[PDB]
Design a protein around this ligand. Structure first.
Ligand SMILES: *[C@@H]1O[C@H](CO)[C@@H](O[C@@H]2O[C@H](CO)[C@@H](O)[C@H](O)[C@H]2NC(C)=O)[C@H](O)[C@H]1NC(C)=O
Lengths: 50, 35, 49
């Protein structure tokens, strides 16, 4: 929905309040999103590196 | 995780505790001679 | 066991390191005079030259 980024997406157990669209924790980094069709919360983690 | 990583220390906590225990036993049994 | 704040030095070291990392990672959201703080948008919204 216009928010772009790379990573790997999994199921999550967070409970968004019925009007938010995504979430961030500290230093403003997105961690979870809500798919506009299924209306479920998905969790984003970066692709592995080192 | 934004290109930054944290590396683990070489010595784990059990080894540090073991060193401290060895030092304490040495000073408690042999005086200062073991130094 | 009872009294707290007896280990101020180690806590101070940890807090200083964490704060330095936090401010460094937060500095990623500043324009520095450019039109946007995100690189993908300026890539996909404006002429390369
Ligand atoms: C978005 O539209 C789709 C198209 O029908 C909906 O998909 C089905 O919706 C019904 C009613 O809720 C479900 O019983 C089906 O299981 C859905 N099929 C799927 C998801 O493949 C979908 O529900 C709509 N989204 C919302 C939030 O209502």
């Amino acid at each position: 929905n216009g928010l772009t980024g790379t990573g790997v997406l999994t199921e999550s157990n967070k409970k968004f309040l019925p009007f938010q669209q995504f979430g961030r924790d500290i230093a403003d980094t997105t961690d979870a999103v809500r798919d506009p069709q299924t209306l479920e919360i998905l969790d984003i983690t970066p692709c592995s590196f080192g | 995780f934004n290109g930054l990583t944290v590396l683990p220390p070489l010595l784990t906590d059990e080894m540090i505790a073991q060193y401290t225990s060895a030092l304490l036993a040495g000073t408690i049994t042999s005086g200062w001679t073991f130094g | 066991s009872s009294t707290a704040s007896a280990l101020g030095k180690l806590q101070d070291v940890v807090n200083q390191n964490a704060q330095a990392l936090n401010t460094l990672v937060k500095q990623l959201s500043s324009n520095f005079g450019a039109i946007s703080s995100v690189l993908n948008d300026i890539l996909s919204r404006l002429d390369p030259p």
